[PDB]
Structure 1
Amino acid sequence: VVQPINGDPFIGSLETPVTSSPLVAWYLSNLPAYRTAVSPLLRGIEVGLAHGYLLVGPFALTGPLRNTPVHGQAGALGAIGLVTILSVVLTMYGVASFEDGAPSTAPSLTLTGRKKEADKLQTAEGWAQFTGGFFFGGVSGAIWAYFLLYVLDLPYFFK
Structure 2
Amino acid sequence: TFQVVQPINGDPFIGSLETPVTSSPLIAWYLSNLPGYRTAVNPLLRGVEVGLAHGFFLVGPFVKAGPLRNTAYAGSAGSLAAAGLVVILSMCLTIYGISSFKEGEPSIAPSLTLTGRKKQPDQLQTADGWAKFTGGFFFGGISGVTWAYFLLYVLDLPYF
Which bin holds the TM-score, normalised by the shorter protein?
Answer: over 0.9
Q: Alignment RMSD, CA only?
A: 0.5
TM-superposed deviation, 1:14: 1.2
1:33 and 2:32 correspond:
no
1:98 — aligned with what? Answer: 101
Q: Where does 1:87-126 land on structure 2 (aligned, <5 Å)? A: 87-126=90-129
- Cα distance per residue 1:51-94 (max 9 Å; x no partner): 00000000100011001101000000000000000000000000
TM-superposed deviation, 1:153: 1.7
Partner amino acid for 1:17?
Answer: P
- CA distance in structure 2 between the aligned counterparts of 1:54 and 1:16, rounded to whole angstroms: 31
- CA distance in structure 2 between the aligned counterparts of 1:26 and 1:17, rounded to whole angstroms: 13
Structure 2 unaligned runs (5+)? Answer: none
2:136 — aligned with what? Answer: 133
1:17 and 2:17 correspond:
no
1:78 — aligned with what? Answer: 81
- CA distance in structure 2 between the aligned counterparts of 1:7 and 1:42, rounded to whole angstroms: 35
TM-superposed deviation, 1:20: 1.1
1:47 and 2:54 correspond:
no
SS in 2 for 1:55: helix
Partner amino acid for 1:113?
Answer: G
- CA distance in structure 2 between the aligned counterparts of 1:14 and 1:32, rounded to whole angstroms: 25
Runs of 4+ residues deviating >3 angstroms? none
The sequence identity of aligned pairs, in percent, is: 78
Structure 1 unaligned runs (5+)? Answer: none
2:145 to 142, 149, 156: 142
Partner amino acid for 1:10?
Answer: F
With normalisation by structure 1, the TM-score equals 0.97
- CA distance in structure 1 between the aligned counterparts of 2:153 and 2:85, rounded to whole angstroms: 20
Partner amino acid for 2:89?
Answer: L
- CA distance in structure 2 between the aligned counterparts of 1:136 and 1:60, rounded to whole angstroms: 21
